[PDB]
Design an enzyme around this catalytic site. Structure first.
Site, PDB file in Angstrom:
ATOM      1  N   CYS A  38     -35.565  23.934  39.702  1.00  0.00           N
ATOM      2  CA  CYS A  38     -34.225  23.861  40.300  1.00  0.00           C
ATOM      3  C   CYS A  38     -33.761  25.175  40.921  1.00  0.00           C
ATOM      4  O   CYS A  38     -33.577  26.180  40.222  1.00  0.00           O
ATOM      5  CB  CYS A  38     -33.231  23.457  39.216  1.00  0.00           C
ATOM      6  SG  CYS A  38     -31.603  23.016  39.801  1.00  0.00           S
TER       7      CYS A  38
ATOM      8  N   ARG B 132     -29.738  26.804  39.974  1.00  0.00           N
ATOM      9  CA  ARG B 132     -29.330  27.129  38.615  1.00  0.00           C
ATOM     10  C   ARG B 132     -28.331  28.280  38.531  1.00  0.00           C
ATOM     11  O   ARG B 132     -27.885  28.640  37.439  1.00  0.00           O
ATOM     12  CB  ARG B 132     -30.563  27.460  37.773  1.00  0.00           C
ATOM     13  CG  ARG B 132     -31.489  26.259  37.475  1.00  0.00           C
ATOM     14  CD  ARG B 132     -32.668  26.757  36.664  1.00  0.00           C
ATOM     15  NE  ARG B 132     -33.772  27.096  37.534  1.00  0.00           N
ATOM     16  CZ  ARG B 132     -34.803  27.820  37.174  1.00  0.00           C
ATOM     17  NH1 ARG B 132     -34.846  28.265  35.937  1.00  0.00           N
ATOM     18  NH2 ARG B 132     -35.777  28.090  38.060  1.00  0.00           N
TER      19      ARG B 132
ATOM     20  N   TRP C 225     -25.100  18.716  43.634  1.00  0.00           N
ATOM     21  CA  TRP C 225     -24.877  18.540  45.073  1.00  0.00           C
ATOM     22  C   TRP C 225     -26.098  18.970  45.892  1.00  0.00           C
ATOM     23  O   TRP C 225     -26.906  19.797  45.473  1.00  0.00           O
ATOM     24  CB  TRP C 225     -23.639  19.300  45.532  1.00  0.00           C
ATOM     25  CG  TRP C 225     -23.700  20.792  45.383  1.00  0.00           C
ATOM     26  CD1 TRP C 225     -24.462  21.660  46.134  1.00  0.00           C
ATOM     27  CD2 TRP C 225     -22.947  21.605  44.477  1.00  0.00           C
ATOM     28  NE1 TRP C 225     -24.248  22.950  45.731  1.00  0.00           N
ATOM     29  CE2 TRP C 225     -23.317  22.953  44.720  1.00  0.00           C
ATOM     30  CE3 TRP C 225     -21.995  21.335  43.479  1.00  0.00           C
ATOM     31  CZ2 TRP C 225     -22.744  24.036  44.008  1.00  0.00           C
ATOM     32  CZ3 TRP C 225     -21.436  22.416  42.760  1.00  0.00           C
ATOM     33  CH2 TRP C 225     -21.815  23.737  43.031  1.00  0.00           C
TER      34      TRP C 225
ATOM     35  N   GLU D 283     -33.081  18.365  51.462  1.00  0.00           N
ATOM     36  CA  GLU D 283     -33.508  17.219  50.659  1.00  0.00           C
ATOM     37  C   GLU D 283     -33.358  15.944  51.474  1.00  0.00           C
ATOM     38  O   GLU D 283     -34.258  15.099  51.468  1.00  0.00           O
ATOM     39  CB  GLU D 283     -32.751  17.082  49.320  1.00  0.00           C
ATOM     40  CG  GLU D 283     -32.742  18.359  48.403  1.00  0.00           C
ATOM     41  CD  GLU D 283     -31.950  18.182  47.071  1.00  0.00           C
ATOM     42  OE1 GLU D 283     -32.425  17.367  46.234  1.00  0.00           O
ATOM     43  OE2 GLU D 283     -30.849  18.817  46.881  1.00  0.00           O
TER      44      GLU D 283
HETATM   45  C1  HEM Z   1     -25.325  22.258  41.945  1.00  0.00           C
HETATM   46  C2  HEM Z   1     -26.218  22.025  42.913  1.00  0.00           C
HETATM   47  C3  HEM Z   1     -27.743  21.826  42.660  1.00  0.00           C
HETATM   48  C4  HEM Z   1     -28.687  22.079  43.561  1.00  0.00           C
HETATM   49  C5  HEM Z   1     -28.417  22.577  44.995  1.00  0.00           C
HETATM   50  C6  HEM Z   1     -29.994  21.727  42.992  1.00  0.00           C
HETATM   51  C7  HEM Z   1     -31.217  21.863  43.607  1.00  0.00           C
HETATM   52  C8  HEM Z   1     -32.394  21.247  43.232  1.00  0.00           C
HETATM   53  C9  HEM Z   1     -33.506  20.957  44.096  1.00  0.00           C
HETATM   54  C10 HEM Z   1     -33.573  21.238  45.626  1.00  0.00           C
HETATM   55  C11 HEM Z   1     -34.464  20.426  43.352  1.00  0.00           C
HETATM   56  C12 HEM Z   1     -35.836  19.864  43.836  1.00  0.00           C
HETATM   57  C13 HEM Z   1     -35.369  18.756  44.782  1.00  0.00           C
HETATM   58  C14 HEM Z   1     -36.427  17.725  45.075  1.00  0.00           C
HETATM   59  O1  HEM Z   1     -37.159  17.947  46.062  1.00  0.00           O
HETATM   60  O2  HEM Z   1     -36.506  16.690  44.374  1.00  0.00           O
HETATM   61  C15 HEM Z   1     -33.998  20.354  42.016  1.00  0.00           C
HETATM   62  C16 HEM Z   1     -34.722  19.848  40.970  1.00  0.00           C
HETATM   63  C17 HEM Z   1     -34.179  19.752  39.707  1.00  0.00           C
HETATM   64  N1  HEM Z   1     -32.902  20.155  39.309  1.00  0.00           N
HETATM   65 FE1  HEM Z   1     -31.359  20.867  40.467  1.00  0.00          FE
HETATM   66  N2  HEM Z   1     -29.791  21.368  41.666  1.00  0.00           N
HETATM   67  C18 HEM Z   1     -28.395  21.354  41.445  1.00  0.00           C
HETATM   68  C19 HEM Z   1     -27.768  20.948  40.255  1.00  0.00           C
HETATM   69  C20 HEM Z   1     -28.491  20.517  39.120  1.00  0.00           C
HETATM   70  C21 HEM Z   1     -27.963  20.000  37.866  1.00  0.00           C
HETATM   71  C22 HEM Z   1     -26.440  19.763  37.550  1.00  0.00           C
HETATM   72  C23 HEM Z   1     -29.014  19.818  37.052  1.00  0.00           C
HETATM   73  C24 HEM Z   1     -28.997  19.300  35.614  1.00  0.00           C
HETATM   74  C25 HEM Z   1     -27.927  19.668  34.898  1.00  0.00           C
HETATM   75  C26 HEM Z   1     -30.234  20.163  37.741  1.00  0.00           C
HETATM   76  C27 HEM Z   1     -31.533  20.085  37.251  1.00  0.00           C
HETATM   77  C28 HEM Z   1     -32.713  19.868  37.971  1.00  0.00           C
HETATM   78  C29 HEM Z   1     -33.970  19.392  37.429  1.00  0.00           C
HETATM   79  C30 HEM Z   1     -34.289  19.027  35.969  1.00  0.00           C
HETATM   80  C31 HEM Z   1     -34.945  19.321  38.593  1.00  0.00           C
HETATM   81  C32 HEM Z   1     -36.432  18.877  38.631  1.00  0.00           C
HETATM   82  C33 HEM Z   1     -36.373  17.393  39.020  1.00  0.00           C
HETATM   83  C34 HEM Z   1     -37.716  16.693  39.067  1.00  0.00           C
HETATM   84  O3  HEM Z   1     -38.710  17.128  38.400  1.00  0.00           O
HETATM   85  O4  HEM Z   1     -37.762  15.659  39.813  1.00  0.00           O
HETATM   86  N3  HEM Z   1     -29.879  20.613  38.977  1.00  0.00           N
HETATM   87  N4  HEM Z   1     -32.759  20.911  41.943  1.00  0.00           N
HETATM   88  C1  JRR Z   2     -43.096  11.518  40.383  1.00  0.00           C
HETATM   89  C2  JRR Z   2     -41.851  12.396  40.295  1.00  0.00           C
HETATM   90  C3  JRR Z   2     -41.786  13.439  39.366  1.00  0.00           C
HETATM   91  C4  JRR Z   2     -40.657  14.281  39.286  1.00  0.00           C
HETATM   92  N1  JRR Z   2     -40.655  15.258  38.331  1.00  0.00           N
HETATM   93  N2  JRR Z   2     -39.595  14.051  40.127  1.00  0.00           N
HETATM   94  C5  JRR Z   2     -39.634  13.026  41.064  1.00  0.00           C
HETATM   95  C6  JRR Z   2     -38.475  12.762  42.037  1.00  0.00           C
HETATM   96  C7  JRR Z   2     -38.855  12.970  43.531  1.00  0.00           C
HETATM   97  C8  JRR Z   2     -39.728  14.218  43.744  1.00  0.00           C
HETATM   98  N3  JRR Z   2     -38.952  15.117  44.630  1.00  0.00           N
HETATM   99  C9  JRR Z   2     -37.939  14.410  45.373  1.00  0.00           C
HETATM  100  C10 JRR Z   2     -37.672  13.161  44.505  1.00  0.00           C
HETATM  101  O1  JRR Z   2     -36.431  13.365  43.818  1.00  0.00           O
HETATM  102  C11 JRR Z   2     -35.340  13.037  44.674  1.00  0.00           C
HETATM  103  C12 JRR Z   2     -34.426  14.247  44.818  1.00  0.00           C
HETATM  104  N4  JRR Z   2     -34.030  14.723  43.513  1.00  0.00           N
HETATM  105  C13 JRR Z   2     -32.763  15.408  43.466  1.00  0.00           C
HETATM  106  C14 JRR Z   2     -32.843  16.753  42.757  1.00  0.00           C
HETATM  107  C15 JRR Z   2     -31.400  17.238  42.680  1.00  0.00           C
HETATM  108  C16 JRR Z   2     -30.777  17.980  43.701  1.00  0.00           C
HETATM  109  C17 JRR Z   2     -29.458  18.411  43.590  1.00  0.00           C
HETATM  110  C18 JRR Z   2     -28.766  18.047  42.437  1.00  0.00           C
HETATM  111  C19 JRR Z   2     -29.394  17.279  41.442  1.00  0.00           C
HETATM  112  F1  JRR Z   2     -28.779  16.889  40.317  1.00  0.00           F
HETATM  113  C20 JRR Z   2     -30.691  16.899  41.550  1.00  0.00           C
HETATM  114  C21 JRR Z   2     -40.767  12.182  41.139  1.00  0.00           C
END
Ligand code: HEM
Ligand code: JRR
Ligand code: HEM
Ligand code: JRR
Ligand code: H4B
Ligand code: H4B
Ligand code: ZN
Lengths: 407, 411
Positions: free
Chosen positions: A106, A109, A278, A283
């Site tokens: 993330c 953070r 947000w 994305e």
């Molecule tokens: C406040 C604005 C936030 C931004 C801009 C942001 C940004 C991002 C981005 C760009 C990713 C990867 C996106 C993707 O391609 O799927 C990501 C993944 C993640 N974020 Fe955030 N985040 C935010 C808030 C949060 C919050 C509130 C949480 C949890 C409390 C969080 C926890 C996570 C986790 C656990 C992942 C990994 C998700 C996965 O493995 O699919 N983030 N974050």
């Molecule tokens: C297979 C698999 C594993 C994994 N760990 N994760 C995925 C979700 C897919 C991967 N990558 C894009 C998509 O997830 C969709 C975008 N996820 C939003 C992350 C985000 C952003 C801002 C605020 C938030 F609360 C959360 C799939």
């Protein structure tokens, strides 16, 4: 033991000591790196509980105090007799904020400590879940001025009584395969979209159909629910200079709200725990619109900008990708909905790394996920060495429940 | 034990069995991944196994594993090692050796090319001047008037590590950068230190934004000495844009030949500390990194100014807009002058067919995702969606410290 991280743009060198308090496995060995692979008991519970409670009491600067010591005993007694334990509210809030703090993937953070936690451990039914969720959505959305939130359903028990949100995000668009051969809407959700219809969802069968929620309470068969349409803030997509852009009929939702993860705090497993913050502009603009497996609209966009599509070397995909993303940012901004651009997000994540380094001794970061899917090297994170390791409390991916449950 | 990689765009799953032939370490453990870290005298004891391994490899692949010819060569190398403490590679082995180092270069997107490599053998070289001339011929052959060809020149192996051949330049052709008394550099900022070193050995510097530095060359562990690449040997492309006529007025050019000279070729346990190699550019190397890194020519501000972009908020993506135009210009300029170049779409697409073919015929292909994905437009190139395994196979190219940090001066 101690390890250095170098920034190759600025020459700043940081020293990571936090990795030695590292717990779980990475997937890598001395022989093989797996950095780019997407998915690499009473006896078991008490060490986990102890380890968590020790970090909690140290964080509140009462490490080794009687308040500390008394709590370690109570949890141990509750484990020995009950086979699990319950977190105090303070512990639940700390646990959650830190699972986000520890999320190595993330970029956002810097915000970790502003998480609004909704304790939904008293929930018992899918209707209850629906209510807690709608309240989450509205609170988080805040009429466009988004705020971070997570809602925590009851923790796993014997494991056959799991609470789960089946959707991967609270808010996503349907996908239907067409007799044509192509795909209408989001092809990421094709499977899930059928599952909904196979459970009596009247799908309007359009391109941007907001999906119904499938809630599972207490390991029961899950049920459908339509988020009040007035709660789902969506943004029509237009360009500050390309008038024809709106004619593509593009819209995206304001609230990214991840709902397929597992929150682990002091050995306890919260299998339904939707959270939301947000969007970073990329994305939607890069991934959701331009991935081939997704809305895949580059082809059609370049065709409106009158670009030379005859050779890859004209960089027409690249030109169109920029414009598409300019338009997402502009659309959200025009409508006063929080969005952040990748320059600004990554810049803020460097500041947050430096804070985590002097304040905590480090910061687990996954470079593959942190670097935006556009303009990597013109963002500061590209040049930043990052160390990746698994700390607890954590969020962890869980597989689609439909692969799992029985009826 | 087999491992699988997924392509998230195509759902194609591959099975890697080659990681089983990997011995060197990665920097990674079960508890830490150092995947994004840039940098994570040998006894007879350790040498023969390394020889043996290597020669087992060579003979397997020519389909002679177990032959009298293979056993003879093992015995002959064996003896040579305990008699003289080192050994000499046959020509066929050297060539095989250096092709495989490139083949195993996991940070290299250009490997579909691996079997077409022109090896020059410079193992009879004995002086710096000898080195200049070997290199001049390298550069001439490789350039081929703009129709670039891959080549490597291999100087003599290390002995006691007191007698090393080195090329002090990190690339054979590279521009000077001169720090000004006000903090601005004039020229390419990556080469300030080397530039000063050259200036110190008596190179007289033109001092412009694009001076081609002299070769600094070390033979036989001796101090090194200056040399000018003949300018008619240095192919350069002035940068202009197809639709923007003002682009040429920015006064930019780049050299055609990318030629890495600072790495170490290990074959069968032998260490070649001078082995400059060359191929051709993927456009983004110049357009994204060389021009647009903040620590390099840093032309973003200047280009976006001229384009009249909105520069008052990063959310106009002005920086992203200017980056693309610059990259269009680079590819345009090179194609117009008939100098070989490949764009990042074409290059990553080729690497995917290569990788896939390498799993089919070799049971794998070590690949470093962090370096393979281009530094602009990541996800609209297919490598982004590609899971990759990274591991170290020999023969191999290794990084080595800049030699002024190590070299003991004779004077
Ligand atoms: C406040 C604005 C936030 C931004 C801009 C942001 C940004 C991002 C981005 C760009 C990713 C990867 C996106 C993707 O391609 O799927 C990501 C993944 C993640 N974020 Fe955030 N985040 C935010 C808030 C949060 C919050 C509130 C949480 C949890 C409390 C969080 C926890 C996570 C986790 C656990 C992942 C990994 C998700 C996965 O493995 O699919 N983030 N974050
Ligand atoms: C297979 C698999 C594993 C994994 N760990 N994760 C995925 C979700 C897919 C991967 N990558 C894009 C998509 O997830 C969709 C975008 N996820 C939003 C992350 C985000 C952003 C801002 C605020 C938030 F609360 C959360 C799939
Ligand atoms: C056919 C033309 C080639 C192309 C388009 C190409 C592409 C690239 C690129 C873009 C990089 C990283 C660039 C950077 O950021 O420094 C690279 C790295 C590398 N390539 Fe190639 N390559 C080519 C030929 C070669 C050849 C002929 C060899 C050796 C025979 C080679 C071996 C390597 C090695 C060892 C690296 C890693 C360099 C380092 O770690 O500093 N490549 N390749
Ligand atoms: C510290 C460190 C370690 C390492 N392995 N490498 C470096 C060189 C950096 C990589 N990125 C910027 C600079 O390298 C610039 C030179 N890279 C050209 C690679 C290339 C391309 C096409 C054909 C070829 F034959 C070779 C530094
Ligand atoms: C195979 C590769 O790991 C995969 O495509 C990754 C790469 N980096 C990513 N980075 C982010 N932020 N999100 C993603 O979904 C991915 N996908
Ligand atoms: C810290 C990070 O590993 C470093 O900046 C890397 C990232 N990926 C790269 N990829 C390539 N091809 N070339 C590079 O110089 C780098 N730099
Ligand atoms: Zn790793």
């Amino acid at each position: 033991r101690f390890l250095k991280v170098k920034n190759w743009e600025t020459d700043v060198v940081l020293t990571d000591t936090l990795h030695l308090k590292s717990t779980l496995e990475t997937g890598c060995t001395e022989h093989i790196c797996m950095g780019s692979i997407v998915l690499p008991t009473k006896d078991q519970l008490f060490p986990l509980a102890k380890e968590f409670l020790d970090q909690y009491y140290s964080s509140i600067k009462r490490f080794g105090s009687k308040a500390h010591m008394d709590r370690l005993e109570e949890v141990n007694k509750e484990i020995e007799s009950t086979s699990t334990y319950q977190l105090k509210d303070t512990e639940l809030i700390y646990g959650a904020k830190h699972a986000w703090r520890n999320a190595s993937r993330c970029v956002g953070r810097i915000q970790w400590s502003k998480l609004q936690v909704f304790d939904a451990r008293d929930c018992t039914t899918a209707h209850g879940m629906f209510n807690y969720i709608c309240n989450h959505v509205k609170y988080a959305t805040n009429k466009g001025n988004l705020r971070s939130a997570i809602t925590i359903f009851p923790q796993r028990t014997d494991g056959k009584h799991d609470f789960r949100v089946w959707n991967s995000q609270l808010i996503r668009y349907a996908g239907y395969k067409q007799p044509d051969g192509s795909t209408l809407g989001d092809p990421a959700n094709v499977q899930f979209t059928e599952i909904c219809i196979q459970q009596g969802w009247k799908a309007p069968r359009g391109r941007f159909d907001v999906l119904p929620l499938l809630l599972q309470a207490n390991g029961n068969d899950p049920e459908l629910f339509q988020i009040p349409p007035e709660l789902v803030l969506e943004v029509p997509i237009r360009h500050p200079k390309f008038d024809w852009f709106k004619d593509l009929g593009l819209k995206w939702y304001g609230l990214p709200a991840v709902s397929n993860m597992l929150l682990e705090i002091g050995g306890l497993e919260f299998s339904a725990c939707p959270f939301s913050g947000w969007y970073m502009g990329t994305e939607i603009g890069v991934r959701n619109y331009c991935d081939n497996s997704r809305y895949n609209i580059l082809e059609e966009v370049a065709k409106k900008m009158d670009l030379d599509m005859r050779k890859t070397s004209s960089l027409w995909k690249d030109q169109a990708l920029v414009e598409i993303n300019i338009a997402v940012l502009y659309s959200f901004q025009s409508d006063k909905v929080t969005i952040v651009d990748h320059h600004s997000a990554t810049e803020s994540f460097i500041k947050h790394m430096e804070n985590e380094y002097r304040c905590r001794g480090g910061c687990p970061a996954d470079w593959v996920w942190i670097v935006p899917p556009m303009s990597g090297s013109i963002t500061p994170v590209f040049h930043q060495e990052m160390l990746n390791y698994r700390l607890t409390p954590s969020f962890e991916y869980q597989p689609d429940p439909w692969n799992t449950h029985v009826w």
